């Protein structure tokens, strides 16, 4: 059933819906939740990386600094869909900027900090140069 | 007058627009100074390396997908013996493809390096 759903181009449709429509934050929360459910599917990673979902997630985090649920879902997601290509040859400055900004703005929220630090550890597992950034 | 009062307008000889939505990362020039003025481009708009050929005198763009990972850098090697010309590619996976500048069916890989090949600069000291 999951393979059939994936073959139905669910990822492309949901990414287009949440990327083309940057307003109406409710659809953004729904899209982040749907992607979060998508990622742990058996074949999710390769198509998600090919479609370029990571840029959409980063843009969503940029346009919604103050919302809590969007930030939590995005910070949990970023570590999930991060690949070596996204931090290729040591380049990952928008990643560090967004992660530090999100963690600093919400310092007391335990869940946001936990997700952000798990994401940061996952990123550091790939490339050690990121720490410098 | 202010638009015409510029050196950018005098010394910008040609301007070529590539096909829609292509991300080319590296370029080299087919420069034997007498063979064929043209450009080799390494596309990166997809995670499967494409080598494209740009004929300058006709603005002809012909792409070809040959690499599993995106091409990072390109280099042109010219061996004077037998008038040999080749072009070598460097892929993100680590491979190193070599295809003839003239012949199109001379694909042959080389040692698969540990990681990505970020430079392929070629020069002679004597020996190339």
Swiss-Prot record, chain A:
Q: In which tissues is it expressed?
A: Expressed in pyramidal neurons in all cortical laminae of the visual cortex, in neurons of the substantia nigra pars compacta and caudate putamen (at protein level). Expressed in neutrophils (at protein level). Expressed in the brain. Expressed throughout the adult brain, but at a lower level than in heart and liver. Also expressed in placenta, lung, skeletal muscle, kidney and pancreas. In the brain, expressed in the cerebellum, cerebral cortex, medulla, spinal cord occipital pole, frontal lobe, temporal lobe and putamen. Expression is particularly high in brain dopaminoceptive areas.
* Annotated compartments: Cytoplasmic vesicle; Perikaryon; Golgi apparatus membrane; Cell projection, Axon
Summarize what the UniProt record says about post-translational modification: Ubiquitinated by TRIM1; undergoes 'Lys-48'-linked polyubiquitination leading to proteasomal degradation.
Q: Which disease is it linked to?
A: Parkinson disease 8: A slowly progressive neurodegenerative disorder characterized by bradykinesia, rigidity, resting tremor, postural instability, neuronal loss in the substantia nigra, and the presence of neurofibrillary MAPT (tau)-positive and Lewy bodies in some patients.
For this chain, the family text in UniProt reads:
Belongs to the protein kinase superfamily. TKL Ser/Thr protein kinase family.
Q: How does this chain assemble?
A: Homodimer. Homotetramer; when activated by GTP-bound RAB29. Interacts with PRKN, PRDX3, and TPCN2. Interacts with VPS35. Interacts (via N-terminus) with RAB29; this interaction is direct and stimulates kinase activity. Interacts (via ROC domain) with SEC16A. Interacts with APP; interaction promotes phosphorylation of 'Thr-743' of APP. Interacts with MAPT. Interacts with RAB8A, RAB10, and RAB12. Interacts (via N-terminus) with RAB32.
Task: Report the domain remarks.
Answer: The seven-bladed WD repeat region is critical for synaptic vesicle trafficking and mediates interaction with multiple vesicle-associated presynaptic proteins. It also mediates homodimerization and regulates kinase activity. The COR domain mediates homodimerization; it also mediates homotetramerization via interaction with the protein kinase domain.
Any idea what job this protein has?
A: Serine/threonine-protein kinase which phosphorylates a broad range of proteins involved in multiple processes such as neuronal plasticity, innate immunity, autophagy, and vesicle trafficking. Is a key regulator of RAB GTPases by regulating the GTP/GDP exchange and interaction partners of RABs through phosphorylation. Phosphorylates RAB3A, RAB3B, RAB3C, RAB3D, RAB5A, RAB5B, RAB5C, RAB8A, RAB8B, RAB10, RAB12, RAB29, RAB35, and RAB43. Regulates the RAB3IP-catalyzed GDP/GTP exchange for RAB8A through the phosphorylation of 'Thr-72' on RAB8A.
Question: Per its record, how is this protein called by name?
Answer: Leucine-rich repeat serine/threonine-protein kinase 2
Q: Gene behind this chain?
A: LRRK2
